[PDB]
Amino acid sequence: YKLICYYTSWSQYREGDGSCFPDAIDPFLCTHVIYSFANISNNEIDTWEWNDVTLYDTLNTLKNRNPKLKTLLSVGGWNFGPERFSKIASKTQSRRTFIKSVPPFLRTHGFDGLDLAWLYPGRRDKRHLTALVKEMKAEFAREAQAGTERLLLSAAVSAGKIAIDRGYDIAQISRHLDFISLLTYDFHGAWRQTVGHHSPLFRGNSDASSRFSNADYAVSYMLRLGAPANKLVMGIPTFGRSFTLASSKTDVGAPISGPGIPGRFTKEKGILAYYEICDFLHGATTHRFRDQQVPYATKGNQWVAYDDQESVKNKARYLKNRQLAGAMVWALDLDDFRGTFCGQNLTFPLTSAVKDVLARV
Numbered sequence: 031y032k033l034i035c036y037y038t039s040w041s042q043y044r045e046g047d048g049s050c051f052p053d054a055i056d057p058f059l060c061t062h063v064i065y066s067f068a069n070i071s072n073n074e075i076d077t078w079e080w081n082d083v084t085l086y087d088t089l090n091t092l093k094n095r096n097p098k099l100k101t102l103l104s105v106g107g108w109n110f111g112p113e114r115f116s117k118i119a120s121k122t123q124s125r126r127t128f129i130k131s132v133p134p135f136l137r138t139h140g141f142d143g144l145d146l147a148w149l150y151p152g153r154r155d156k157r158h159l160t161a162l163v164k165e166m167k168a169e170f171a172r173e174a175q176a177g178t179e180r181l182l183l184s185a186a187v188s189a190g191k192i193a194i195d196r197g198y199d200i201a202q203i204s205r206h207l208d209f210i211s212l213l214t215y216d217f218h219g220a221w222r223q224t225v226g227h228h229s230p231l232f233r234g235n236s237d238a239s240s241r242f243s244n245a246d247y248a249v250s251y252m253l254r255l256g257a258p259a260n261k262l263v264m265g266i267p268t269f270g271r272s273f274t275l276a277s278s279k280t281d282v283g284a285p286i287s288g289p290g291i292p293g294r295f296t297k298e299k300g301i302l303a304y305y306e307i308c309d310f311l312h313g314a315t316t317h318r319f320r321d322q323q324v325p326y327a328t329k330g331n332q333w334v335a336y337d338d339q340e341s342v343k344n345k346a347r348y349l350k351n352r353q354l355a356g357a358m359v360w361a362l363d364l365d366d367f368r369g370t371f372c373g374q375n376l377t378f379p380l381t382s383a384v385k386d387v388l389a390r391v
């Protein structure tokens with residue numbers, strides 16, 4: 031099985047223990063580590079952070095400890111305007127320039143492949159996404175003629191049915207991608223004012239509409255659209271989504287006034303790292319949706335939907351039972367990487383729990 035793990039560039043700036051650099055990563059934990067995110071300047075792939083070349087070097091040195099480890103560089107991300115992707119892919123000329131710049135860049139910095147994170151392709155982009163993937167892969171096949179191992183090509187894809195129907199030709203891109211990571215953790219819409227879990231595994235007998243917003247549905251749908259199980263990887267979150275309650279009601283349906291207050295280290299309203307959640311739990315009230323198989327917690331007027339060792343192991347077994355290629359984790363820097371916040375004298379408790387299940391067969 032594959033265990034795809036993302037590492038984010040901006041995590042280096044978090045204060046104190048929250049600060050995470052590539053060398054904190056256990057070389058034997060994941061099978062693939064993806065660095066997020068690369069930028070595109072003058073239609074060419076390029077660095078993002080001022081010290082990226084140094085961090086690229088630090089990450090790729092892990093391969094001197096674990097020779098089987100593969101690394102990829104992801105282009106795009108949520109702070110990358112999708113309009114920019116749309117513009118590059120729409121014109122055969124700009125598209126070709128970008129494609130041509132990738133192999134040399136990856137080779138120079140020691141990466142084994144490219145991960146595409148266009149979030150998200152609209153109805154008018156579907157056509158061009160296919161061309162982009164097809165042509166990128168053709169370039170990689172051609173570059174391998176030089177005697178070096180062929181570069182890998184992957185893509186992170188929405189798990190939302192409407193988003194999938196709208197911007198992706200799944201059957202077509204599946205044949206050219208080495209693997210596809212399903213973003214099965216952004217299910218509760220940032221649009222409404224209700225409490226809800228962002229990464230439920232199952233539908234849950236307690237609600238008719240949005241039977242589409244759960245991991246099981248997204249996986250089944252992808253398989254029906256033509257994506258081979260051996261290329262599908264299920265996304266598992268290492269963070270939680272928080273809300274500020276509008277009333278004393280804490281159960282399903284409870285009204286929301288807005289996102290939860292920022293975590294001390296992550297400082298982003300709406301989300302908390304797993305290590306911050308481990309601290310939050312002290313004095314909190316824990317619950318678990320039996321139908322969806324995921325937990326949530328509450329303290330004061332703060333409501334948090336998250337994943338723990340149990341739910342993560344649960345998703346990993348589901349994935350194996352469906353014979354998928356493996357799991358993808360977002361993200362290493364949000365798990366208890368130091369292993370000092372979540373009790374168990376264990377580094378990367380969430381990611382390790384996933385690895386354990388995958389190692390069972």
Ligand SMILES: CC(=O)N[C@@H]1[C@@H](O)[C@H](O[C@@H]2O[C@H](CO)[C@@H](O[C@@H]3O[C@H](CO)[C@@H](O[C@@H]4O[C@H](CO)[C@@H](O)[C@H](O)[C@H]4NC(C)=O)[C@H](O)[C@H]3NC(C)=O)[C@H](O)[C@H]2NC(C)=O)[C@@H](CO)O[C@H]1O
Nearest residue numbers: 040043044067079080106107108109110269296297298301
């Ligand atoms: C849950 C989750 O992971 N969601 C992701 C989004 O959070 C993510 O958006 C990213 O948001 C983070 C934090 O909110 C943001 O981090 C900032 O990164 C910049 C660098 O790009 C830092 O700026 C540096 O400051 C120091 C001094 O303080 C300078 O020395 C340095 O030169 C600066 N860098 C630059 C630009 O020159 C900020 O300090 C840091 N701020 C925070 C909040 O700590 C990221 O930039 C956002 N990511 C990107 C790629 O823009 C979103 C990104 O796509 O993806 C989700 O996964």
Ligand SMILES: *[C@@H]1O[C@H](CO)[C@@H](O[C@H]2O[C@H](CO)[C@@H](O[C@@H]3O[C@H](CO)[C@@H](O)[C@H](O)[C@@H]3O)[C@H](O)[C@H]2NC(C)=O)[C@H](O)[C@H]1NC(C)=O
Nearest residue numbers: 068069070071072073074075076077078079080109110114
């Ligand atoms: C990711 O790539 C972006 C696309 O190139 C880049 O956007 C910006 O690109 C240039 C460079 O800063 C900005 O302005 C130009 O810069 C030169 C100065 O060297 C000027 O002479 C020229 O007139 C022009 O102003 C753009 O304003 C900006 N592009 C936009 C917003 O359309 C991003 O900077 C890059 N991201 C990071 C963090 O590296």
